[PDB]
Amino acid sequence: GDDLKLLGAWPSPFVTRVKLALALKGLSYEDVEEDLYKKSELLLKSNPVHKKIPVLIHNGAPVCESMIILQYIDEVFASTGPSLLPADPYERAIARFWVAYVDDKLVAPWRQWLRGKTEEEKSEGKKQAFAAVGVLEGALRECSKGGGFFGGDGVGLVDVALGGVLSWMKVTEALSGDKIFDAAKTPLLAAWVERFIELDAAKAALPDVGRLLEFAKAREA
């Protein structure tokens, strides 16, 4: 039939996205843990170009990059469970637009906030991350259509893209003292966070914040 194996390291948000996607469709797969200081031959041969996770392996064939994997699953397993992407080409473009926004205007500056070298750098990342969240709120306002997700009535691509970093966001709040989806500024997003984490898929896939936090504090130190 179809064997699926996910190569990942549990703290990675990029892995978390793929786990959400698999869980959303109810797809069974083997979850394989990779040590990034001692990568397996299967990892090194499946993603020789970046040697990064996640990597989904389907019947022995690798697919890399979290958002690409998500669409690969959407297309191959269309007849199984809900789709992350809409049917309509316009709607699909818009969703891809916001995924890109998330990656470039949110996740990247957030990374800089966290692993920035100079304090100014940490501070600019932070600043940018916050401005991005205010823009994402307007996107949710326009995409919910009363269902509450970036995908409308069901979880979509954008929801997963963002959803994958939610454990890290909570960890960030604990380290910094700052609330990323502060309800007073971004009430729609604060409520979206609560709706998302309550999904069964999210419960199965998002990493534990306590462990995540210990892991983070050791890397910061």
- The distance of Cα 85 from the centroid of its chain, to the nearest Å, equals 15
Q: How far is the CB of 42 from ligand GTX (least distance, A)?
A: 14
- Rounded CA-CA distance 137/58 in Å is 35
Q: Which residue, 112 or 186, has its beta carbon nearer to ligand GTX?
A: 112
Shortest gap between Cβ of 148 and ligand GTX (angstroms)? Answer: 25
CB of 64 to ligand GTX, least distance (A): 7
The count of other CB atoms within 10 Å of the CB of residue 187 is: 13
CB 80 within 8 A of CB 25: yes
Q: Is the dihedral of CA 78, 79, 81, 87 positive or negative?
A: positive
Q: Which CB atom, from 99 or from 133, has the smaller least distance to ligand GTX?
A: 99
Residue placing its CB nearer to ligand GTX in the complex, 106 or 148:
106
Q: Which two tokens stand for residue 89?
A: 């080409």
CB of 193 to ligand GTX, least distance (A): 20
In the complex with ligand GTX, which residue's Cβ is closer, 11 or 151? 11
Minimum distance between the CB of residue 12 and ligand GTX, rounded to whole angstroms?
Answer: 4
- Pick 186 or 216: Cβ nearer ligand GTX: 216
Give CA–CA dist 134/122, Å, rounded: 19
The residue whose two tokens read 């991350």 is 129
Q: Which of 6/9 has CB closer to ligand GTX?
A: 9
Amino acid at the residue 168: W
Q: Using CA atoms, how far apart are residues 26 and 80, in angstroms rounded to an integer?
A: 8
**Contact positions vs ligand GTX (CB under 6 A):** 9, 11-12, 14, 36, 52-54, 65-66
**How far, CA to CA in Å, does 137 sit from each of 10, 84, 144, 192?**
28, 20, 10, 10
Which residue, among 57, 29, 70, has the nearest Cα to 159 in the 3D structure?
A: 70
3-state DSSP call for residue 27? coil
In the bound complex, what is the minimum distance in angstroms from residue 153's beta carbon to ligand GTX? Answer: 26
